[PDB]
Structures are given as structure tokens and as C-alpha cells.
Design a protein around this nucleic acid. Structure first.
Lengths: 73, 121, 124
DNA sequence: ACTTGTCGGTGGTCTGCTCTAACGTCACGGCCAACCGATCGGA
């Protein structure tokens, strides 16, 4: 049954994220991501979103967003 | 204003240092102000200004290994200032165009410089 | 401290900010503005410093903090700050060699020297 | 000579207080709907 894909099913999940307007500033969807490595941003296109067909694992970035932080000590 | 000239001088000196790799002391002491004695006093004051917080890694940095003055941290100051409307640019363009000497750099130097300066402004 | 240090620190801070910094934050954050006796001396000094910076040529814009914020702050447009690209080098040598030869008017010679210094800061 | 602090002013926006004179005068939109045992206030 496993080899011949008898009891095999396709499951689709939907993840949605919105960049709104905050009081401290505006939220921008981009591939900047201040403190990460460089290989994490390998599957993201120029506009900061993953590419179609790219396999994603747990914890992988799908949409790159960033928010204003303000002044913190 | 005798302070404004210094301020402009520093605002152009920092990009000049960052754009000329390892400029020796004599070149700076002869180009940006003939008085080399005040060059050290201006570098000392530049070493004190920087990003808010004014901690190491925010102020501008340098290497005085010998004569070469290299900048390692610029605190955002990388480009020079823009030629002010009319004023300096106007006078420079007027002098460049109203030259009363028969053409010697006319073929591809004077006209090219005039056109490029006008486009840049 | 020193007036030149205050001006340089203010220029750097307004260059590196991302949002419109209000004057109240300028007083506490920028060094040299925290030694004023009262809020009126600081206000007049900051107004004079803004006037000087605007007259110099540095683009100092005043605008809202943000859409949902009624505070009003100041910034400096880094894109309008200057123009990086420069042309050839042979023509610039001729331009510098003829920058000033006999002019005596202080405004003219100061303007020519400023233009030459900016050209040197933008390549030769 | 340049800076600097105290003085004085123009103009603008956000916030709060006061006033408006024909005559007017006693609320609704809506269930609750089990089902048991215990207990205080009535009759």
C-alpha cells in the first residue's frame, strides 16, 4: 500500500500574512531580515516571497516581513 | 560665516578620505588646506563625532599607521555634499563658459565638462 | 562642547535616521544640546542651527512623524544629499587649473574653493 | 566678530468650555421554557 500509493492523500495548507500600517511606522514585505544567516534567504525572490516549487521545511521563511521597532535601550 | 566653511570642509574631507585609498599625510595637508598643522587638530575633532550614543562602533574611525590616513568606520558619511544652487556652481559654470582665451581644451574637454556639470546640477 | 561638534553630530544623526526625529528627541539624543539652561535657549539655538544648515545647502526637511502620529520632526534626504556619479578626468583637470586665477571678490573665491573641494571629494 | 540667552512676536493645530428662544413633558425589545434537592419567608 505504501509502495504503490494506494492510501495516499494530498493535503493543502494556506498561510496568509498582511503588512498593515502601525503608529510607529509602516510594515514592509522585503528580503532584508536584519539578523539571520545568508542561506535562509536563498528561496526568496526579489520581492521577498518564496519561489513556486521550492520545498519548505519547519521554520523556513515563507514571506519576509519586518516592522518598525522604535527606540530601545 | 567662518564656521560654515569648516563644516563644509569636514563634510567633504570625510568622503575624500574614504574615496582615496590610503592617502598620505602630505597630500591631505596640501590639498584640503595648506596648513598641515591644523590637519591634526581637525582629525582629532572628527574622531569625536559620530552616531547617536557616541560609543565605539558609532564614531568615525581611522588608521594612523604612518602617513596614510584610512577610514574604517564612516557613520553614514560616504558621499560628498551637493553643489549648492547657483552660488558655487553658478560661479564655476560662468567662469568655465565665459573664458576669453582661444580654445585649447575646447574639442572634447571644455564642452564635455560644461555639459556634464550642467547635467549633474 | 563645541558648535562645530554640535553641527556635525546633528548632520550625522539626521542623515542616519529612518523616521522624522522630533526636536524633543534631538535635545536628549544629540550631544551638545543638553547643556542649555532652559527650554527657550535650546529652542532658539536649534532654530538658528536649522537656519544655518538650510542656508548652507544641506537638505533639511520638516514633516510629520508618521500617518498616525501628530508629532512633527526633521530628516535629511540621503538621495537628495548629493549626486555620486562624475564624468571624465581629463576635462576636470582643465576645469580645476582654470578654477581661479585673478578674482579678488571674497564670495567668488570662496565659492570656487568650495566647488573645487566638493569636486575633490567626488574624485580629483 | 561670533555666539548665546532672555525678550517679544505671527501663524497654526489640538483641546475644552459656553451658547442656540414657536411648541414640544411619565422607557423598552424580549424570554421564560431542564430538573433535581435544600431552605427561608408566608399563609
Amino acid at each position: 500500500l505504501v509502495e504503490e500509493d494506494v492510501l495516499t492523500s494530498i493535503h493543502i495548507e494556506e498561510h496568509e500574512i498582511d503588512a498593515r500600517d502601525t503608529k510607529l511606522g509602516a510594515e514592509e514585505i522585503t528580503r532584508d531580515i536584519p539578523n539571520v544567516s545568508d542561506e535562509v534567504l536563498a528561496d526568496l525572490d526579489e520581492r521577498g516571497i518564496v519561489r513556486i516549487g521550492a520545498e519548505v521545511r519547519d521554520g523556513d521563511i515563507l514571506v519576509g516581513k519586518v516592522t518598525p521597532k522604535g527606540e530601545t535601550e | 560665516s567662518q564656521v560654515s566653511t569648516r563644516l563644509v570642509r569636514l563634510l567633504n574631507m570625510v568622503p575624500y578620505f574614504q574615496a582615496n585609498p590610503k592617502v598620505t599625510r602630505a597630500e591631505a595637508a596640501a590639498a584640503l588646506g595648506v596648513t598641515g598643522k591644523q590637519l591634526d587638530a581637525d582629525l582629532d575633532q572628527l574622531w569625536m563625532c559620530g552616531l547617536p550614543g557616541y560609543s565605539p562602533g558609532d564614531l568615525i574611525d581611522f588608521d594612523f599607521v604612518g602617513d596614510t590616513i584610512e577610514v574604517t568606520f564612516s557613520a553614514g558619511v560616504d558621499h560628498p555634499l551637493r553643489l549648492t544652487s547657483t552660488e558655487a556652481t553658478g560661479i564655476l559654470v560662468a567662469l568655465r563658459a565665459l573664458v576669453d582665451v582661444p580654445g585649447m581644451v575646447d574639442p572634447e574637454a571644455a564642452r564635455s565638462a560644461i555639459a556634464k556639470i550642467e547635467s549633474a546640477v | 562642547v563645541s558648535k562645530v561638534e554640535r553641527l556635525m553630530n546633528l548632520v550625522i544623526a539626521l542623515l542616519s535616521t529612518r523616521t522624522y526625529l522630533p526636536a524633543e528627541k534631538i535635545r536628549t539624543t544629540v550631544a551638545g544640546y543638553a547643556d542649555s539652561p532652559s527650554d527657550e535657549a535650546f529652542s532658539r539655538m536649534f532654530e538658528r542651527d536649522k537656519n544655518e544648515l538650510r542656508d548652507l545647502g544641506i537638505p533639511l526637511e520638516t514633516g510629520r512623524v508618521s500617518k498616525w502620529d501628530s508629532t512633527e520632526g526633521y530628516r535629511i534626504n540621503r538621495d537628495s544629499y548629493a549626486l555620486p556619479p562624475i564624468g571624465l578626468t581629463a576635462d576636470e583637470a582643465a576645469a580645476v587649473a582654470v578654477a581661479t586665477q585673478l578674482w579678488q571678490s571674497p564670495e567668488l573665491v570662496t565659492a570656487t574653493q568650495n566647488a573645487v573641494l566638493k569636486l575633490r571629494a567626488a574624485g580629483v
